[PDB]
Every structure is written in C-alpha cells, then in structure tokens.
Design a protein around this ligand. Sequence first.
Ligand SMILES: *[C@@H]1O[C@H](CO)[C@@H](O)[C@H](O)[C@H]1NC(C)=O
Ligand SMILES: *[C@@H]1O[C@H](CO)[C@@H](O)[C@H](O)[C@H]1NC(C)=O
Lengths: 533, 535
Amino acid sequence: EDPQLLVRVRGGQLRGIRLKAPGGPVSAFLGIPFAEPPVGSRRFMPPEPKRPWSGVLDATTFQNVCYQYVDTLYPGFEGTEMWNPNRELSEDCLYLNVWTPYPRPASPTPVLIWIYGGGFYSGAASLDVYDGRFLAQVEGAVLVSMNYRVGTFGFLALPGSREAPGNVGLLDQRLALQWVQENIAAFGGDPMSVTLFGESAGAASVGMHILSLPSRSLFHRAVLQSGTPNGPWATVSAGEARRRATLLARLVGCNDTELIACLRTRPAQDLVDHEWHVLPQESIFRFSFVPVVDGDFLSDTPEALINTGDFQDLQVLVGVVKDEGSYFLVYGVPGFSKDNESLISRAQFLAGVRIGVPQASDLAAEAVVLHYTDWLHPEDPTHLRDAMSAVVGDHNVVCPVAQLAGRLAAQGARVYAYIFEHRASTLTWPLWMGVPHGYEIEFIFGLPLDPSLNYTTEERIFAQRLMKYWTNFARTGDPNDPRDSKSPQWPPYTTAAQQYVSLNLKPLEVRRGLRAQTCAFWNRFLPKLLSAT
Amino acid sequence: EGREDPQLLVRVRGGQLRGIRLKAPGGPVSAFLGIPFAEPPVGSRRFMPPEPKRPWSGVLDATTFQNVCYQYVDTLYPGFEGTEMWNPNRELSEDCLYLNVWTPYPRPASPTPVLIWIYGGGFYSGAASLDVYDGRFLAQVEGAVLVSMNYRVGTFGFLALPGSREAPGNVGLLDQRLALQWVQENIAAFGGDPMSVTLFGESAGAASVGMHILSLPSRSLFHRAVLQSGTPNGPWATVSAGEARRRATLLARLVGCNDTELIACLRTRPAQDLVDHEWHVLPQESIFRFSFVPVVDGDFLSDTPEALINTGDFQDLQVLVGVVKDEGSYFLVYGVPGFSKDNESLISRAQFLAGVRIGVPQASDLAAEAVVLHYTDWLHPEDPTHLRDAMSAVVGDHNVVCPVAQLAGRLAAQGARVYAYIFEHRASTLTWPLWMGVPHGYEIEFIFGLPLDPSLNYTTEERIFAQRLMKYWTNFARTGDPNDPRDSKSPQWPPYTTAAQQYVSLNLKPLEVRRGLRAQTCAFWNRFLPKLLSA
Ligand SMILES: *[C@@H]1O[C@H](CO)[C@@H](O)[C@H](O)[C@H]1NC(C)=O
Ligand SMILES: *[C@@H]1O[C@H](CO)[C@@H](O)[C@H](O)[C@H]1NC(C)=O
C-alpha cells in the first residue's frame, strides 16, 4: 500500500496506480465517479452529485465510455480507430481521471482540465491521445479529464420541459469542474489556477463555460483548439432542438412528459440507430444533438454573448490546424476518399459546396464557389480539391475562431492565437489531407516522448516545446517562457495588429491576419446575403 | 496651280485638295486637314444621320484643322495642362464633320496599311485635332497612312427618341462609319491601302471601335482593331432604349420643350442651351457616367454588346486590347468628396463607402457592401492610403479593366486572335499628382510618338520606349501580329487565351509576360455582381 496512491476526497477514499512515464513515475487516479449514474429515469436529466462510498474505491483503471455512435466507415484503420471507444459503452459513464507527479506536488500546482472532442456525439477521456502522464511527468502538471454524455443522452432537448431541459452533457462538465474545486487540493492541485483546454466540440464546450456565468467561478483560463462556441455547428435553437427530438421519437415510435417517458424505455442502441436521421439537409460537419440556446445555460446565442460580453480578467489561447476541413470530406462529399488523391471535377466541387455549406441558398453557394475558385486555374482538379477542404475548414473552424479571437480581444480579454502546421510523420491518412483536424492533440499531450511510438527526434523536441507553451499559459496566462530571452516572443492577438504564430518544426514565426480577406467573406458578407434572402 | 508643291495636290470623290508639308523630327510628312466627309449636320439636320458631303468646285484648302464638334468644356482646373490638353483647340460648331489624313512625304510607292483613329472623351467631348493625336510621327517614322475623323458628341451625337425618324440615336456612330466609307473610297489617292484598314481608339473611341466590330454594316469597312482602355460592353458605353427616351425627354423639359414636336422644338434651341443642361439628366450622382451615349436601338446595335460578344462569330478577327495601370484615379477628382489633384487625397473609411455609391451608381445596398468588403484590406481597414488606392481601383476595375477582361475572354473563346497589354509607364512630363499613378489616357502620347519631338522634354528612354510602341501598333496593323518577324532577340508577345490568359507589361523594361487579367477581382464584377443585382 503506497501512501502516495491513497487519497481522501469528499466522497471517501481512492486508490490510484503508479504509472510509467519515460522520465519517471506518475500517480494516476482513473475512473473516479463525480455523479450518480444517469441511468433509468435519470436519462436526459441534469447530473446529481455522487453519493459518498465506503472503504477504498479502486481508481486504477479507466471506466466505461459514454454511449455513442461508433465509426465504421474504415474498419481496422488506425486513423479512425484512434477516436473510437477503447472501453465498454454504458450510460453509466460519469467518471473523471487525475494524473499528478510522483511524489505528489509539494505545493499547489496549476491544474489543466481536458474536455474531449467528437462533435458532441462521440469521444471519451480514455483514448491514448489524451494520456496525461507526459504533462504530469515532464511539466509537473496536475491533469484532469472527464467523461460527459454525448449524442441523444447528453444533448436531446425538449426546451422548456422538466425532463429534457437540454445541455446536460455540459452540466456533466460543470459538475466535474465543481468536483475539481472541492477535491483537487487533496491531490496537490491548485484550485485557484484551473485552466480548461479542449479540441473541436471540446473547445466549443470550453467556450460555452466562458459564456455561462455559473461556470465562470470554476476556472481562470481557457484554451480552444480548432473549435468555438460560435459558428454553424456548435449550437442549435430551441425550435430546431425540439424538432430533432420529436423526429427521433417518431422514428423510435413514441405532451412532453409522455414523449420523454417513452424515450426512457428505449434501449441505448435504439436511440443511436436513428441519431443520424434527424438533420434537415445532407451535410458534413453537422451534428444531430448539440448544445441548445435554452435561455438558461446559454442566455442568448453565442454570437450575441461574445458580442456583448465583458472579458477583462480572462486569458485565452485559440488556434487551428493547417487543414481543418480535409478529414470531413470523405464522410459524404462524392469524389473524396482516403484511398486515392481525390482529384475532383468542377461539377463535383459545386455539389460538394451545397453539402459543406448546407445552410446556403443557391446564391450564397454561388458566392462561395466564386470566391474559392482560382480563376487562373478554374478547372484544375488539385485546386478544386484543396478549395473544397478550405471551404469546409474556413466555414466551420478558422473563420469562427478569427471572429472569437477578435471579439474577445476587443472586449478586454488577453488572447494568443496559433496555426498548427506540422504533419505527424506517423500519420495514417493520405498526404492530400495535410495536417487534419485533431492531429495537433498527440503533440500537445506529449506522445512523441514515448520512444515505442516511432516519432522522429525533431518531433519529440517539438512536443516538448508545445507542452511548455500550454503549461506556461496554464501557469501564468502567457505561453512565453518567462525565464528565457530570445524566442522570438509569441505576441498577444489584437484586432488592430492581428498577430498570431505558426507552430511547426521551425522556430516561432509571427504572422498577421488569420485568413483576413476570406474570413471577412464568411463573417461579414455571407450573413447579409442570407438575412436578406 | 503651277507654283504649288506638286506632291500636295490630291483628288478625292468630292473634288480637289491642297494639303501641307509638315516638319517631323526625321523629315517631312504630307497632311490633309479638315476634309469634309458629310453635309454639315446643322438646322433641320440636328439629331439626323449624316448625309455624304456634296462635291465642291475648285481646290479645297486642306491645310488647317477644322471646327470641333459642339461640346462641354472642362473648367474644373483652369490653366492646368492636365485638363487643357483634352479641351477643344479649334472653334466649337455643329458644322464639324471633317477628317484628317497624314501620309509619308513623298506619298508612298506601294499601297500602305491605313490606321484610323477614333478619339475618346466619354461620348461628350473630343476632337481629332488635339496634339496627342498628331499623326505626323507614325507617318514619318513608320510610313503609316493615318486618318482621324471628328464625330458628333453629346446630345448632337447621341440624343435619341428610339423608333422616331427625327432622332434615331447613334448618329455619332454613323458619322464614324461614313468616314470609314470615305476611307474605302478615297484612301488609295493618298497611297493608302483600303484592304488593310485598322481601327484604333481610346476610352469612348475604343468603345466605338468595339461597336463597329459588333455592327455588321461597319464590318466590311475595316480588317483589324485596337481597343485602348474601353469596350462596347460594360456599365457606361451604352444605354437601353428606355433610358435614352427618359434622358432625351428630361433634357427637352429642362430647355422648355408625339416625338416630332419634341425634336422640332429641340432643333430651335441654341447648341449651348443643350450643352448647359446635358449633365442634369443622369439618374444618380456618379462618376464615369455620361448622359448621351450609344443606345441599344436594335439597328446599329441589334442587341446588347454583352449578348453580341457572347454569341458572335469572331473567327477572322484580330484585336489588340489593353489598359493603363491606374484607370480610375482621374475620375475621382470630378465628384468623389475627399479627392483632389492638389493634395494626396488621403481619405477616411466613411469617404470610401460614400465614394463606392457614387462610383458604382447602379449598385443596390447589398452590392455596394459587397464591393466594399472585397476592396477593404482587412489587415489595415482604416488606412487612408489604402482606401485612396482602393477607391481608384474600384472605379478603374468596374469601368475599364474588368470589361476589357470580359471582352478579351469572350472574343478569344470564339475564334478571334487577341493580344493583351497593361501599360505601366508614367510620363516624366505628367502634370497630375503622383498618387494618380498612370492615369486613363496617358499611354496615347506614347503610341503616337510625341516623345520623338525634341522640344517636348521627354527622356531618351521615353523616346526609345515610344518607338517600341509605335513598332508594335504598326506591326499589328500590318499583319495582325505586334511582334517583329525578324527580331527574335526581343521577348515575344503571346496571344491572349482563355486557357492561359497571357498579357504583356508595357514599360521601359523589355516585355514581361503575366498571366490572368485581374482574374480574382474580375470574377467578382463579371460573374458575381450581375447575379447579386438579380435579387
Ligand atoms: C484634400 O482636398 C480636398 C478638396 O479641397 C479636401 O476635401 C480634402 O479634405 C483634402 N484632404 C486632406 C485630408 O488633406
Ligand atoms: C522644356 O524644357 C525647357 C528647359 O527647362 C523649357 O524652357 C521649355 O519651355 C520646356 N517645354 C515644355 C514645358 O514643354
């Protein structure tokens, strides 16, 4: 009985496990429950705090993954399987994981809290790419990650109802943050220095905690990687959530109370079977059950909230990867596949645009096509393919990120921005996808420090750099090494100068304007084109 | 006769002519100035098509320029060469249908290719007698036969009540065609070759050239065309029949006036009265818009220029087309607040959004906003220098550069041999401020070879550059190809194609080939904007 691995939290005693990290040992406490299991009549409901337990609870293994769709499109392929559940599915999934250094920190240590992506329909805090042992070992970070309910179970809402009020998956996240406040000191974490970070839907969740007042007293800094609370995919309105839930119920054969009660009688897989049948158009980068503008968790649209919010005592790191859109095209755009070069025709490109911008009218879609066509080479298959990627990435990620960066800076927040430009050498996906959505994560979490993974020696050095920016940012609100002259420095992003840095194998380079002309099209013009039509 | 220079006496269909021996730098040239080619379009002939000049008796003295067609005179900057050079330099009169011929001296031995110049000035001004149009240098240095004609401008040339008999519209274009017919019949008396006639012109002159390409009765009158900073298509070169009726009716009311009665009343009005009100008829506050221009009558122009270029057969056609570096800058001082020739015209963002409404007068609110969003530099959105240069580019691109691109592309796709240039050298002698860069109209003096006149103060480099441009123009007139057959040392000017979109830079440096004539921006004006305005 290693007394390093024995902790008393408010609910009772936990036994962690000592894990091996390349530079030494770390204490991991995995599968710690923070809520009553949301099963039975607790489906679709806000999470209740976990009841106190007796004796010593075993926290040496990851718990179950929240019930979700499992990707099947490319069976056995590591590029997709890395994002698949790596534990048993269950609605009993409300557990978090803590990594600390070994021995546990002598003094209060900044806490990083990770919130996975997966489009609000998948994900799990147990995937290898979220392994927190490296950050814990190399940087002395206390790292926390939680499971939260996804798909219908987290986000199915009949707005205004008692038994499906929406956003419960975010409330799951809020409870896990509350748990960190009440318990993290026992692990040597500092509850007065909590940084949230997350990628894709994980980032938009971070953003919603920024935009929801009850969350604001649970953290101090935020990192948003390749996702935002604003934009076309992260929220739906009350009316459109109501519609999708009602439609899903009809599809599984089911007064709000009565509708939800019948939904509760249904096996988990039955709800998942019809998850994808509720979207109003054929689309990519669009997800069925996502946070809803409820007037409660979200008092208004993210758009309204970021426009009018006051962000004075807030520090934020935001960024994108070089190729945010490539990945998505293979999931419904005719002419795209990982198994060839996906060189498309012009006609395929116009059709791809109606799918990438499913909300777009004929004219708006025309505007998109005309803007992304290279008129020097209008029919060049390579350009058309790269443009299709760009349309999707810009519309869903880069331009929403630029908008967020701008509003926050203008409203007093301290903002740092990046673009991630290094393609992992170990990448399973073909070269034309470049640096795809999600492939910065393994570098930030420090996987290349694991020799058995076959990352190049330069990639290991790169990983070390990124863990430093992230943890420096967690420590101080500033990603710059405070005891290191020469970098050159990573400057704050501001609306005037619009400075941001490239992260790649070469040293930091400062650029200005994050797709400034193109984001002006998405952020300023396009809204006017639809709002008149 | 008996005592005159025997080489200056020529006979044409209308009678005998006496011309003048003129000094050019390399030697003498023959000029025949102010040859009548129509009956004076005066009195009951105002607004009417031209009738050919009736034969005269005796020897017509053809030694001086004749009247300039009645027109508005620019007074914005009195005394300033920049504006004065474009102003009438002979008496204003409705009796103005005269033409000019320069030939080598003595007149050439074998039939020589003919260049016909059609001046610009928005269809409200111009004259073939202006110094920048002096054909003496092309005649002496290149051996060219050069012809230029006066044609009616303003109300006298374009006021139309479409369908009527007393004001059919496009009569200024008919003046031009008559002078083309005069060249067919008479040019051989001067040693000119009626089987090698090339039209060239700038601005409205270029629009005019393009309209002769699109109007079949003019087609048999010439073989090749150069269009300099202007096209028959685009937003200013033509009006609909409806809009011309509207403007002609309004102008009638303003001077206090059934189509026959209206026109008969307008005929009793003095010429100056009409000029005094010609600017009061435009539908909006604008720049680069002119009141009385060619009308789509379904006769001279059987359909819109845009329709005619999209469906025409241009297999047999050779065209040279191009633009200057700063097409729009000139236009900004005549109506956009914030701009002047006397300061850097550094403007604010507000002055930019207002300038866009005036420069794109036909744009709705959405389109205006589209224009503004496209031309804004979102890194420095409030920067005055950028806003100044963007305002210029908006006006240049909308009116000249993008219409030219549309033209080159549509003509090429459909058989024509098209050569394309951008002219980028600013005259050392220019009197407009530096911010205006290379303004509209300022390549003309180089094409015509004025820098060859020692007394004009051009650099030696400019004199050489001018000779190069004279070479290209006359090669293209001669053969349909601007390149020198011998000279394989000098880089080649490739044709413009839809596939490759090639064009050359014209400056002091050897020809450099560039690709894509403002390709991205022109997709906005030519593909996007029309759709936006259909909603
Ligand atoms: C330059 O001159 C114009 C016209 O006189 C004036 O309106 C403008 O304000 C001046 N520009 C500046 C800011 O110096
Ligand atoms: C050209 O330069 C000379 C010498 O300065 C001057 O006397 C003459 O008037 C100039 N001619 C112009 C301004 O065209």
